[PDB]
Amino acid sequence: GESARSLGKGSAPPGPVPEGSIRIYSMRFCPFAERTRLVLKAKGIRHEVININLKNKPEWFFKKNPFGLVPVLENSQGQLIYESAITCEYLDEAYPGKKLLPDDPYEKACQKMILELFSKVPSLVGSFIRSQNKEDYAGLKEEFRKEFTKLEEVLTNKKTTFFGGNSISMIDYLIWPWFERLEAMKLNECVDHTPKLKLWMAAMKEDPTVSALLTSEKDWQGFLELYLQNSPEACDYGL
Amino acid sequence: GESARSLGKGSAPPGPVPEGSIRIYSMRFCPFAERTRLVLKAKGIRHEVININLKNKPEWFFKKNPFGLVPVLENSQGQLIYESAITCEYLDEAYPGKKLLPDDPYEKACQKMILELFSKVPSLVGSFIRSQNKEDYAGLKEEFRKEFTKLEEVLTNKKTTFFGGNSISMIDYLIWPWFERLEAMKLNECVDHTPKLKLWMAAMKEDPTVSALLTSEKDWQGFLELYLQNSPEACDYGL
Ligand SMILES: *S(=O)(=O)Oc1ccc2nc(-c3ccc(Cl)cc3)cc(C(=O)O)c2c1
Ligand SMILES: *S(=O)(=O)Oc1ccc2nc(-c3ccc(Cl)cc3)cc(C(=O)O)c2c1
């Protein structure tokens, strides 16, 4: 439990990444970094995690990513890779095991097109934070439904359980972390008129990788409570 | 000249793409679609162009891309690919000739990270359109310089003429179309304190692919004049 505690302002910069492992600079409740962690787990990649206190960042972390954002991968050769979708594609290419992206140029482009379709959803988390009452909440639900109908159309067209076929693949993991938090946001009704999307969510929760990393509603709310209180302890909720 | 004229509202949907060619739905002055055209030319890919009148779109074009945006690739097998960066990566993978993206997972990720670094520049075209006087213009220049300093740092770190090395590669073509329009926007002073970036621009203009597709300042201004007048003839400036 204690080894997961975040590194913040004044922490010593970590040592080199050992041969045979890759490191991810992450935060336990960041959906972008969850993408990378899903991919690490799905591909069976040996790794270490350093959590970053994003409310109280170490100065040395800007040497890992000049933008100060997680996720960041660092390997034994000293190479640094950031931007969540880039870290995921890098891992899929650089490591053996289950290929998460198809080899076919067209089918890979399709996955990336679905990812572009999804692009408005992460910024609706900001809309969620700024929603203060029942009227804001009604409008927010409508904003989520609008985006979710687009994803429903993809699953209708394909007639598969997942966004890349009948097997879980990269695209599913790239979109999953925002769906993971719907119940905690009280936005689970927004999939009510998207039945294929609703079944997709149930199938995702049964995926061994997703299940291994899933954070409970209570933990989501614990984190959120502290994060909106602007606590430097938010990132270490539950330790 | 006349074959380049755009298809608009009421035009007949085009026939199938012939075997041996790929089609791009484009517009002659769209920088996103210029990315794809640069890649088609650089890789020596046989193709046909259908220009879309973006101020007066054919209803059938939404069957090619539900979002109604260029570029869109359509091949002889009926597959449709859109989103400019996706069309480019697709072409690099699907076709023979010069590989524009490196094979190495890390160096490919680096190109994509530079692309993410560039992400604010296309939206500064909107800032440009909304700039109405000399005070707005001063602020606009400062906004461009801020982004350009980030790219200057990439070239300083690498000590190469281009963003992916000493040879032109995918990343250069992905960012080029916005730099092509700097002189016409009267923003060429914004590279004055970024000397490596300024030399990059001069080297790009000498690239045979870039040179083959480059549009003159006068044509840029012709298009812009008509586009801001909201003309349905803007897209066909010069015919
Ligand atoms: S910060 O840590 O720099 O960035 C950040 C990380 C994670 C965030 N998660 C949420 C969130 C968490 C739980 C629930 Cl139920 C809803 C939303 C929100 C935000 C945010 O934008 O405030 C996060 C920011
Ligand atoms: S529209 O055609 O749907 O989209 C579109 C295409 C191209 C644009 N080009 C410019 C532009 C052209 C020349 C110069 Cl000097 C500066 C800017 C602007 C815009 C825009 O956002 O208005 C374009 C829109």
Can you put this structure into words, describing what you see?
The structure is a homodimer of 239-residue chains. Chain A has 239 residues and is of the alpha+beta class. Chain A has two domains: 1-100 and 216-239, Glutaredoxin; 101-215, Glutathione S-transferase Yfyf (Class Pi), Chain A, domain 2 (Up-down Bundle). Chain A is built from ten helices and four strands. The first copy, chain A, has helices at 31-42, 84-94, 105-117, 124-130, 134-158, 170-180, 182-185, 195-206, 208-213, 217-228; strands spanning 22-26, 47-51, 72-75, 80-82. In chain A, strands 2-1-3-4 form a four-stranded mixed beta sheet, with helices on one face. In chain A, a hairpin with a 4-residue loop joins strand 3 (72-75) and strand 4 (80-82). In chain A, helix 3 packs parallel to helix 6 (170-180). Chain A is globular, with a radius of gyration of 18 Å. The A-B interface holds A 79, 81-83, 86-87, 89-90, 93-94, 105-106, 108-110, 112-113, 116 and B 79, 81-83, 86-87, 89-90, 93-94, 105-106, 108-110, 112-113, 116. One copy of the ligand *S(=O)(=O)Oc1ccc2nc(-c3ccc(Cl)cc3)cc(C(=O)O)c2c1 binds at residues 27, 29-30, 54, 125-126, 129, 181, 184-185, 220, 223-224, 227 of chain A. Residues 27, 29-30, 54, 125-126, 129, 181, 184-185, 220, 223-224, 227 of chain A line the site of one copy of the ligand *S(=O)(=O)Oc1ccc2nc(-c3ccc(Cl)cc3)cc(C(=O)O)c2c1. Chains A, B: This is Glutathione S-transferase omega-1. Chains A, B: Keywords: Acetylation, Cytoplasm, Oxidoreductase, Phosphoprotein, Transferase. Chains A, B: Glutathione binds at residues 57, 70, 83-84.
